[PDB]
Amino acid sequence: MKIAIPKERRPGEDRVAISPEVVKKLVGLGFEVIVEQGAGVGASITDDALTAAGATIASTAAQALSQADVVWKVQRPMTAEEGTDEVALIKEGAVLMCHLGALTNRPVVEALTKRKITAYAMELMPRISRAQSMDILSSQSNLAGYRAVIDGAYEFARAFPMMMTAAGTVPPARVLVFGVGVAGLQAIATAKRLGAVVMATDVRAATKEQVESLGGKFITVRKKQAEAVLKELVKTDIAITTALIPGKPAPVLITEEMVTKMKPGSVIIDLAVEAGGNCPLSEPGKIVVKHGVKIVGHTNVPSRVAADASPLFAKNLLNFLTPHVDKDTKTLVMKLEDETVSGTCVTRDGAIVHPAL
Amino acid sequence: MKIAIPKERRPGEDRVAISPEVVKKLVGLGFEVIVEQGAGVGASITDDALTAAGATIASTAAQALSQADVVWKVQRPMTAEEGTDEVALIKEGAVLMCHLGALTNRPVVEALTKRKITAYAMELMPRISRAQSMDILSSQSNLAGYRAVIDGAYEFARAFPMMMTAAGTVPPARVLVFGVGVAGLQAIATAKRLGAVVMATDVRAATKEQVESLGGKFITVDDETAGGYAKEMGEEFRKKQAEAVLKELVKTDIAITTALIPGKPAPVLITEEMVTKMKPGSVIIDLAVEAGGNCPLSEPGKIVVKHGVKIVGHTNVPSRVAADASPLFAKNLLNFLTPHVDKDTKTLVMKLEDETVSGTCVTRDGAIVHPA
Numbered sequence A: 001m002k003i004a005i006p007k008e009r010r011p012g013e014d015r016v017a018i019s020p021e022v023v024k025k026l027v028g029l030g031f032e033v034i035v036e037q038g039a040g041v042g043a044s045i046t047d048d049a050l051t052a053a054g055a056t057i058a059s060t061a062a063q064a065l066s067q068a069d070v071v072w073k074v075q076r077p078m079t080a081e082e083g084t085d086e087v088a089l090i091k092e093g094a095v096l097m098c099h100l101g102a103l104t105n106r107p108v109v110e111a112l113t114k115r116k117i118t119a120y121a122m123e124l125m126p127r128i129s130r131a132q133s134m135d136i137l138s139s140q141s142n143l144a145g146y147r148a149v150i151d152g153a154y155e156f157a158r159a160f161p162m163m164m165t166a167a168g169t170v171p172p173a174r175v176l177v178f179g180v181g182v183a184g185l186q187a188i189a190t191a192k193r194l195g196a197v198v199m200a201t202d203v204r205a206a207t208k209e210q211v212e213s214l215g216g217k218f219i220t221v222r223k224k225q226a227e228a229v230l231k232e233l234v235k236t237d238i239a240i241t242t243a244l245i246p247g248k249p250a251p252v253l254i255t256e257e258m259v260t261k262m263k264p265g266s267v268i269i270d271l272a273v274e275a276g277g278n279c280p281l282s283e284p285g286k287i288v289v290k291h292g293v294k295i296v297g298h299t300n301v302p303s304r305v306a307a308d309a310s311p312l313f314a315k316n317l318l319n320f321l322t323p324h325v326d327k328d329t330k331t332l333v334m335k336l337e338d339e340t341v342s343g344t345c346v347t348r349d350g351a352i353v354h355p356a357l
Numbered sequence B: 001m002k003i004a005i006p007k008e009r010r011p012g013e014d015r016v017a018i019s020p021e022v023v024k025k026l027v028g029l030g031f032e033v034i035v036e037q038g039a040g041v042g043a044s045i046t047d048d049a050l051t052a053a054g055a056t057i058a059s060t061a062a063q064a065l066s067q068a069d070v071v072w073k074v075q076r077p078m079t080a081e082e083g084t085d086e087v088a089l090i091k092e093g094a095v096l097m098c099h100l101g102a103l104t105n106r107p108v109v110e111a112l113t114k115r116k117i118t119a120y121a122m123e124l125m126p127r128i129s130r131a132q133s134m135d136i137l138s139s140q141s142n143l144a145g146y147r148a149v150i151d152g153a154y155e156f157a158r159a160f161p162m163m164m165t166a167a168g169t170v171p172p173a174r175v176l177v178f179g180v181g182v183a184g185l186q187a188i189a190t191a192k193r194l195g196a197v198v199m200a201t202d203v204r205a206a207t208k209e210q211v212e213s214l215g216g217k218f219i220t221v222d223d224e225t226a227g228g229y230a231k232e233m234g235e236e237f238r239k240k241q242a243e244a245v246l247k248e249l250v251k252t253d254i255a256i257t258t259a260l261i262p263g264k265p266a267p268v269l270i271t272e273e274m275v276t277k278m279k280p281g282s283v284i285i286d287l288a289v290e291a292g293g294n295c296p297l298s299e300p301g302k303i304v305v306k307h308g309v310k311i312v313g314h315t316n317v318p319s320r321v322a323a324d325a326s327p328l329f330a331k332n333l334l335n336f337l338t339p340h341v342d343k344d345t346k347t348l349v350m351k352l353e354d355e356t357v358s359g360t361c362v363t364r365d366g367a368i369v370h371p372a
């Protein structure tokens, strides 16, 4: 059975749904792994690294997908509606696993249905302990949190750590995190090891135990809490906002007003800029300089860590798929009763199985 | 007594030779401090912050250095030939303190002489324990080593620390620091903060203890350097070092080169041949790029990609951390000047017997002192 991985065509996407380690396991299961040439370059994965692991390199995506029984991608395929029709390249009746937007994209689903393609929307993965190893949202958000801090320190004109030197001492950077989700947690851990003083906040107080767990200071003041956040913000150096609730615009945690009171040289990294942004001043894909403050709004953050994001994404897919491989008959048999299968399947045999729109 | 600090005008310089804390110290010493308007913007220091510290703001740099008895700058003033004649703005007989690049910028030196200005090239500061607090090279390089790691992490498409997630374990980054001077030391400490596995190498055996004390491993090449600083090393060594460094360079993800040799061009530590055997996606941060570079592929002010490796050669790295580099620079100047402000009588008399004075002063009252 053939499994193909094409190069991500959507501008800005540099991750790839494969890694040499996974290629070895796929071949081990009985698959022939085909990868579009140049697919992993963005992720520091050369065509030679992949062929050394057991993969065959195909030129162009049409070639790679022409006879693939299984297709893995990072972002959902493009439709003729967006130009290049990637769905028409997938064999009819083939299996697709990738972040399908699922919730918000109708045309891709309609397109998949017309070709009788069974598509599993990895991002819809049931939130059960046993499926944590197949959860892409988590793996990518973890790296996204780490990178928020890195980009924060790169844009900051001060050093994160407190440095006591012959020439005086460098005070530590003060980092404030809005959103103690998976990403928020890594932003806290990363800002901590760099030596910053880390404050965290979230409307969900159940996180209070974890913020303190990593060394952060939960901000406790319930709306008189807003004054408790303006209090910390006014003396904050790096504000990292990760309030992204998949399937809904992002909350406005920092108004242009809260920003005009911040200090020059301060930095705001809005990880939720795609969904509007926790800060209305952030502009998708740019760094705005307002009131002396830099508002960072990079688009594909996990792609900024593509070389680590890719191997993890590839293992989430392998974890989700391995339980269903026969190998002895070299065929895929997705157990319909499996909760990870029925929950992520958005279209099968020409029928839309999931209601979202 | 008036001390003035103008805005740095050279390309890309965001630092400023002042800070509110230091404006406070100066005023207490009996000084009238004047800072040119917007001189600390690139350093995140507002005119308001300097005013609250007790400083006066002058609309123009000309106005600020007009009556100034002492002038503090980050980089050497520009000559009439360079467009803006800053030397001309300096009051004749005044004292100037800054990184003069004297040894390689004679025109600015003799230009200062023609105005009988007394200049102390802070970069020449004697290499001695009691000077550590007045040494700009150290304060600036220490921040540059930290920055090299931030710029390194920024260009790297992988995470520095080992990540243990539900999707699996991702090993930590492997860092190799070439030249464990002030910059290399902070690079190691900062690389270790982010959780990387750190390797390091230097020609000075004294550095082996410092590297291991930070959790890093030293790469010994031979064993069998100078009066503080390093010398131009031999080829038997130079070729044996490369051979021993390559054993590790092939696993290295981030290589930070900080090797410098007083006078001579920076030593080449990573050849193109060596870069060709590194892992795709690796990053080389060349901090000696301005002195020639430790990697022949580095290009000043650019990020080059050769053989799948990113060669980063940013200029004026201290300015990349300008908001912390400036208050330290200002403190180096303050610590250098303080011992000379007479108290029994109150004026500025630089005692010439002072090693930090005889060594930094390159010109005094129309006469040049030690250009050879």
Ligand SMILES: NC(=O)C1=CN([C@@H]2O[C@H](COP(=O)(O)OP(=O)(O)OC[C@H]3O[C@@H](n4cnc5c(N)ncnc54)[C@H](O)[C@@H]3O)[C@@H](O)[C@H]2O)C=CC1
Residues within 6 Å of the ligand: B126, B127, B128, B129, B130, B131, B132, B133, B135, B137, B138, B141, B178, B179, B180, B181, B182, B183, B201, B202, B203, B204, B207, B228, B229, B230, B231, B233, B258, B259, B260, B261, B262, B267, B269
């Ligand atoms: N006030 C004081 O006492 C000062 C003391 N120092 C001391 O000086 C030493 C280093 O001085 P830095 O300012 O960092 O000067 P630097 O920038 O010249 O140091 C470069 C580093 O690269 C090394 N290096 C040179 N050529 C090399 C080659 N071919 N291969 C491998 N490594 C090479 C040197 O040994 C040195 O550690 C430390 O011991 C430091 O504490 C430095 C400044 C002031």
